[PDB]
Structure 1
């Protein structure tokens, strides 16, 4: 159990950007710029800095060339410069390794703290950032699949309750979770900015990065991404979806970048900003919890995720989950799911929904 520090938590606004290490920068730029339409804030031979249509901070995604694809940092914006000091004190009290750079780790960010957090994830906290042209009314640029915001991260970690407590102390509130009737938590979603999530925990071997999520305005924009992927004959890079989530109630799509970093495209979750926002707990065997329409969750969605780096840039060693596996208990050999609680009709025993089994 991760103790609550005496030192006050930094006041975190929102998820702000991810730095992903990529192996072939030109290939990755083709994906995020040509395919997905993100806007270039800056690039050179080593990095690409990208932002969403409605962003005014410098970037929402930095692609950094390196030998091993991995998450290098997941960055949260804090409310004041002094919150960066607070973050440093808070993580030092937690016994975590920290690194402070007054002029930033990446271009367009100023004073910044990176930490190896207690779950082994590389978090950044910053306030200072170079404002850029906010493109929110640049409909001359707007794509049929336009990514309008950065929405959230999702982290794979072996012990969800341990992580959840730590994130709650840091001021995130859990909006939804997935549990069973035997005490196991499989996943949790938690926010600062008043949407369903700024980050999220998925039970599994970790630390690994499950995905980064961008929003669109409307559901047809997500459909267009799928359609465009078909036209580009890269439909094999559509992992899962499109669908309606149970958890979050968002319309969603998961796609895979050239280094298999998973990207979620997301729209129309709900307001969570009230402090007594009702926490929704879904049962792990409810077949409408992940896809509301009951479509089966591909096994890769549970098993595959990106490496994460330490502050030296080396891959963090993976710690195996010992709690029950969501995959196993729902679609595995001894798995079970239901459409209606207590009804055998529309239930699935040892296989996935809709007539499929694990490959």
Structure 2
């Protein structure tokens, strides 16, 4: 029900950075720099600008001190300076609030457009950015858990098909989704850069930000993040994983920052750059769709996500999902999942897999 503008979509290259508001900058720095090993591009008493090992643009993550932890912006880089004008015209045709800043909203980004999009998310579009030393061969700096790239964002929104249509008009290509036989869609993944995704929609009350994901080179890098968190006696901040995803086929881990912003560590999905890339649809009751090994999805993964801000810095209204809940239909009292479709053996009814019920 979001109309396709007459104005052409901006040519979006990829997800580029997120700006997160955090309440205690020093505690956040300990997490993202000391625990996770991200590289400081700039910092002061109010903000920390961080980048991954292989990045050449100024940053992939901005931590901004503020009163309420929330997503401030999720930024996509566009192909040319002119694409920023294209974005402004596009979102103005959609009737969205926009704000244009020739000098950027954060350090190391030039001409940029921020919008309150039709789903209530603060999107930024920019071309201009300050190039920095690309650390991709700085093995003298390489950590055993090195985060090498920003991979994607994941957004919680109550009506997945409505947002899917809007993102497809914007140029995102759907690669995978989760549906049921009744016709409910629970989640969709969509890309620009030729990986499984740049952003994704997860069914739930929204707008809220589900997570920001970074890549590693290898699976052992993700294991090391887990081991290091055990060493630091902060294993309570490992939310879910590590595991192998069904959707995306990536090896993964979810952890929680000091303000409960969820970060995913991700590796080794597949190439999606061909225009006829085969879509994959999974059934919601398939117990291998989220964790391929059938490990249970922790309930907080379905219920918890970050606030997002509007262009005034105020928290966006959250709308209740009315479509069926993935948690409820799979691991809730009236839910079920299977290992083999139609087989009662290896099926779970009214609880999660591996012998667990909801706490």
- Measure how far apart 1:281 and its partner are: 0.2
- Measure how far apart 1:103 and its partner are: 0.3
Q: TM-score, with normalisation over the residues of structure 2? A: 1.00
Structure 1 residues 91-119: Cα deviation after superposition (integer angstroms, max 9, x where no partner)? 00000000000000000000000000000
Structure 1 residues 251-295: Cα deviation after superposition (integer angstroms, max 9, x where no partner)? 000000000000000000000000010000000000000000000
Corresponding residue for 2:187? 187
- Measure how far apart 1:333 and its partner are: 0.6
Match of 1:75, SS? strand
CA distance in 2, matches of 1:67, 1:317: 17
Match of 1:263, SS? strand
CA distance in 2, matches of 1:182, 1:194: 31
CA distance in 2, matches of 1:247, 1:253: 14
CA distance in 2, matches of 1:264, 1:274: 26
- Measure how far apart 1:218 and its partner are: 0.0
Corresponding residue for 1:99? 99
CA distance in 1, matches of 2:94, 2:123: 14
- Measure how far apart 1:194 and its partner are: 0.2
Match of 2:33, SS? helix
Superposed, 1:217-228 pairs within 5 Å as 217-228=217-228
- Measure how far apart 1:139 and its partner are: 0.1
- Measure how far apart 1:138 and its partner are: 0.1
Match of 2:301, SS? helix
- Measure how far apart 1:220 and its partner are: 0.1
Match of 1:354, SS? helix
Corresponding residue for 2:349? 349
- Measure how far apart 1:54 and its partner are: 0.1
The alignment yields a C-alpha RMSD, in angstroms, of 0.2
CA distance in 2, matches of 1:349, 1:275: 39
CA distance in 1, matches of 2:97, 2:279: 32
Match of 2:329, SS? helix
- Measure how far apart 1:214 and its partner are: 0.1
Corresponding residue for 1:69? 69
Structure 1 residues 178-227: Cα deviation after superposition (integer angstroms, max 9, x where no partner)? 00000100000000000000000000000000000000000000000000
Kindly indicate whether residue 158 of structure 2 is the aligned counterpart of residue 158 of structure 1. Answer: yes
CA distance in 2, matches of 1:15, 1:236: 29
CA distance in 2, matches of 1:208, 1:100: 23
CA distance in 2, matches of 1:279, 1:167: 16
Match of 2:351, SS? coil
The unaligned stretches of length 5 or more in structure 1 are none
CA distance in 1, matches of 2:249, 2:117: 29
Structure 1 residues 26-49: Cα deviation after superposition (integer angstroms, max 9, x where no partner)? 000000000000000000000000
The unaligned stretches of length 5 or more in structure 2 are none
Deviating above 6 A after TM superposition, structure 1's stretches of 4 or more consecutive aligned residues are none
- Measure how far apart 1:329 and its partner are: 0.1
CA distance in 2, matches of 1:137, 1:256: 29
Aligned length in residues: 359
CA distance in 1, matches of 2:215, 2:258: 20
Q: TM-score, with normalisation over the residues of structure 1? A: 1.00
- Measure how far apart 1:83 and its partner are: 0.1
- Measure how far apart 1:81 and its partner are: 0.1
- Measure how far apart 1:11 and its partner are: 0.1
Structure 1 residues 22-71: Cα deviation after superposition (integer angstroms, max 9, x where no partner)? 00000000000000000000000000000000000000000000000000
- Measure how far apart 1:120 and its partner are: 0.1
CA distance in 2, matches of 1:255, 1:16: 21
